[PDB]
Task: structure prediction
Amino acid sequence: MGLSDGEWQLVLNVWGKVEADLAGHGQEVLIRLFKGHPETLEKFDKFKHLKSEDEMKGSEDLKKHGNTVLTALGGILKKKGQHEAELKPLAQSHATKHKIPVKYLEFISDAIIQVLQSKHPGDFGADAQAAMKKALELFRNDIAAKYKELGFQG
Ligand code: HEM
Result:
């Protein structure tokens, strides 16, 4: 489950690229998510009326939640596995209010990796792709344990 020190440095390096525009990257992520797995959009009461992609792209709220989403994941990844404090709140809201099953967390993880590969290939080689996958996998897994405690079967 854990990542080596070098694997984390691969994650932090490609992140450094995402940092310059979190809202724009988060928008792309969510658009891949909704486009590859349309069922996830029903979870979003505000974004649900969005139809095509260009519809999703001119939504200013969508881009702000993109920022919301990657702001929080950034804080998680920069802890390099020591993210208990940061997962506490995210788990609570995604296991009670929102009810986000873990496979939708897998969807969005794939989305993230698709966006990074598309936008920053020079900073996202084979081992950084693997490292980020494990990082998000370690994220999903520790959330899932929190889900258990909270009474959610994701
Ligand atoms: C890396 C994965 C994710 C991160 C870091 C993340 C983070 C957040 C944050 C910070 C919020 C606002 C504060 C809060 O609710 O705690 C939020 C809200 C929300 N999340 Fe997530 N999220 C993730 C994945 C997902 C996925 C995959 C879905 C749905 C399939 C989802 C559904 C929602 C919804 C519906 C809200 C309410 C937002 C609103 O309507 O304003 N989340 N998420």
Observations:
- The pocket of protoporphyrin IX containing FE is lined by residues 40, 43-44, 46, 68-69, 72-73, 89-90, 93-94, 98, 100, 104-105, 108 (CB under 6 Å).
